[PDB]
Amino acid sequence: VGSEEKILISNKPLKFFGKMSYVTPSEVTLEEESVLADINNFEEDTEDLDELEDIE
Amino acid sequence: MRNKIFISHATPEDDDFTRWLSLKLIGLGYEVWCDILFLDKGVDFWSTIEKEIRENTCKFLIVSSTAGNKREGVLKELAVATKVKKHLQDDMFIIPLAIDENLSYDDINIEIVRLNAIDFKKSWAKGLQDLLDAFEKQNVPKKPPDHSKSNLLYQQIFLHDKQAIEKEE
Amino acid sequence: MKELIYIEEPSILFAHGQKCTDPRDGLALFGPLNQIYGIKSGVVGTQKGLQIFKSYLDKIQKPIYNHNNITRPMFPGFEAVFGCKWESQNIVFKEITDEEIRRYLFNASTHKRTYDLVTLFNDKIITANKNDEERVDVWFVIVPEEIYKYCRPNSVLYNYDAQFHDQLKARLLEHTIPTQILRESTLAWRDFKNTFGAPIRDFSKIEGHLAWTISTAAYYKAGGKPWKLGDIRPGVCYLGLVYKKIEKSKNPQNACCAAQMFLDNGDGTVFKGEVGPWYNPEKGEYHLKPKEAKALLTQALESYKEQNKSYPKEVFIHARTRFNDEEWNAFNEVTPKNTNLVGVTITKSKPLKLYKTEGAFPIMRGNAYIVDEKKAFLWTLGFVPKLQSTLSMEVPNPIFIEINKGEAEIQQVLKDILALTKLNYNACIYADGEPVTLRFANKIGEILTASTEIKTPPLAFKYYI
Structure with missing residues (x-):
């Protein structure tokens, strides 16, 4: 910002710690979140077909 | 005095339906015994089932599912239910429950063959209704309904x- | 050093005065608060759509399962979950000839095709319910997939809207008929595949959610109330106010504002806010001139008086834009001295992505970040332990709330909008980011903007969702 004056931005972000929290299960719930991605896929869609056929 | 309903x-493979039926039974007034909410980890299992079956079980409910007719545990519970129904000399002790259409009527174990298995396949509300009215026409002692x-x-x-x-965190 | 305060997960009432947190499990365990005697389904479409709908309804009659009940619970059957009866008999069916579809296909511009098809469905429904003696509570429009695909607004071979269901509900609004449009591929995905040979509308694992949503929409449009809110104070009125703008060409959009109102239950009484030719689309700052502001406030107060007989003690206003001084001054003097008026703005464009140090888990839903007395954050999206999954996708993003005017507790409005986020009816999800007063806002604005020719829309909700 200046030939003599420089502005320092920290490279680590500001942290927030939470009083309440949750349990930590196994990795199956991330697979179920991928199934939730599929939920958002198969719920609704709009003008997907032409770009889908353009990708091959 | 015996008033408990054994399932x-x-x-x-039959967690959800048994949970729903047990919750509806316990909210409707009848006292229901099921291994989901009573038999948990860290405790002995078989002695409690035998004692409650031949001491305080008033009606026996066996699920005649596709996987519910070949497991050893359900067959053993059916055998002790047959023994206690022979001791009690009541044919209405065992009320079979059929929930899967893919299991034909001729492939069930034998204690379900003689008794007409209840209907719970195509729908559940009328099945619960006929189970309830058969219960109150069989004069099972009850408490007033409360979902609390x-x-x-x-x-x-x-x-x-x-x-x-x-x-x- | 600031922390993130916690707001408890709000509760929804159920049958026999029972309190739960999940709508699906609470419905499966208890059911609706009020019972209806029975519904009668009506269908319009081809005979292929008729048999597809019949197959899907009898499948819904059976108890259908999913992968696991932790996230997506199983469907115990419509009769066992609602206490109402669904049957494949006494169903009124009206056929649409595919030859007429072929005749309408070869038109040049798809807009007139959309208009003629929409009007054909509309007057078919009007003729059907104006002659048939059999009452039809909900009409099921089974639109074909190729109609939804090849007759899109930008498909390539003014107040009327190019969207099918928008115009459908807009021109069906003037006769009080609860209708619900069903896409064919949604309930005919078994025989529907893509060009590669796969179902792009796949529900090989997730059809239980489809059954849940369809069943609860059918019960809600019938007239019965599935669930309501637990605690509502004696004299608090929510006013979710729409501030969605259309892009209506040289026609003066100005302010296409509408308003939702929750007062004692989940009942929404939407009264049509004015089109208001003042402040032409060059002036689109949503600054309500005093006469329309006091008219809308009088509408809300009269609805509250009709439904409650008592003057409300506090008015909650939900919107998404900034509020200027003169609009609130117009909002003030009409209100009595005893009541209180407060305005809340909800926005998404503010970025705040809270990440997690260890593991691969998102922010648990319910965290509240308070910046000042006025401004605050609420994490309505993310992980919820009752689901054992995240409702959000990738990283959740919160809704930046800010009270403009009036004195109120910030945690009070935080928990109140958290309770308001649970009342979604068209989709039986656990919760959504925007509150349902703002979730229904854009859709009901799209419904109302598709037909200027009406003057007194019904204030119910069955003819909208």
């Missing part, structure tokens, strides 16, 4: 690992 079913006990049980067991905890 015999396979696990874990059902609500307390549902908050007790089915919310043990699915709740937020008080830890620093």
Whole structure:
């Protein structure tokens, strides 16, 4: 910002710690979140077909 | 005095239906015994089933599912239910429950063959209705309906690992 | 050093005065608060759509399962979950000839095709319910997939809207008929595949959610109330105010504002806010001139008086834009001295992505970040332990709330909008980011903007969702 004056931005972000929290299960719930991605896929869609056929 | 309703079913392929039926029974007034909400980890299993079957079980409910007719445990519970129904000399002790259409009527175990298995396949509301009216026409002692006990049980067991905890994160 | 305060997960009432947190499990365990005697389904479409709908309804009659009940619970059957009866008999069916579809296909511009098809469905429904003696509570429009695909607004071979269901509900609004449009591929995905040979509308694992949503929409449009809110104070009125703008060409959009109102239950009484030719689309700052502001406030107060007989003690206003001084001054003097008026703005464009140090888990839903007395954050999206999954996708993003005018507790409005986020009816999800007063806002604005020719829309909700 200046030939003599420089502005320092920290490279680590500001942290927030939470009083309440949750349990930590196994990795199956991330697979179920991928199934939730599929939920958002198969719920609704709009003008997907032409770009889908353009990708091959 | 015996008033408890025993439900015999396979696990874990019949968790949801047994849970729903037990919750509806316990909220409707009848006292229901099921291994989902009573038989938990760290305790002995078989002695409690035998004692409650031949001491305080008034009606026996066996699920004649596809996997509920070949497991050893359900067959053994059916055998002791047959023994206690022979001792009690009541043919209405065992009320079979059929929930799967893919299991034909001729492939069931034998104690379900003689008794007409209840209908729970295409729908559940009328099945519960005929189970209820058969119960009250068989004169099972009852308590007034209250879902508060059902609500307390549902908050007790089915919310043990699915709740937020008080830890620093 | 600031922390993130916690707001408890709000509760929804159920049958026999029972309190739960999940709508699906609470419905499966208890059911609706009020019972209806029975519904009668009506269908319009081809005979292929008729048999597809019949197959899907009898499948819904059976108890259908999913992968696991932890996230997506199983469907115990419509009768066992609602206490109402669904049957494949006494169903009124009206056929649409595919030859007429072929005749309408070869038109040049798809807009007139959309208009003629929409009007054909509309007057078919009007003729059907104006002659048939059999009452039809909900009409099921089974639109074909190729109609939804090849007759899109930008498909390549003014107040009327190019969207099918928008115009459908807009021109069906003037006769009080609860209708619900069903896409064919949604309930005919078994025989529907893509060009590669796969179902792009796949529900090989997730059809239980489809059954849940369809069943609860059918019960809600019938007339019965599935669930309501637990605690509502004696004299608090929510006013979710729409501030969605259309892009209506040289026609003066100005302010296409509408308003939702929750007072004692989940009942929404939407009264049509004015089109208001003042402040032409060059002036689109949503600054309500005093006469329309006091008219809308009088509408809300009269609805509250009709439904409650008592003057409300506090008015909650939900919107998404900033509020200027003169609009609130117009909002003030009409209100009595005893009541209180407060305005809340909800926005998404503010970025705040809270990440997690260890593991691969998102922010648990319910965290509240308070910046000042006025401004605050609420994490309505993310992980919820009752689901054992995240409702959000990738990283959740919160809704930046800010009270403009009036004195109120910030945690009070935080928990109140958290309770308001649970009342979604068209989709039986656990919760959504925007509150349902703002979730229904854009859709009901799209419904109302598709037909200027009406003057007194019904204030119910069955003819909208």
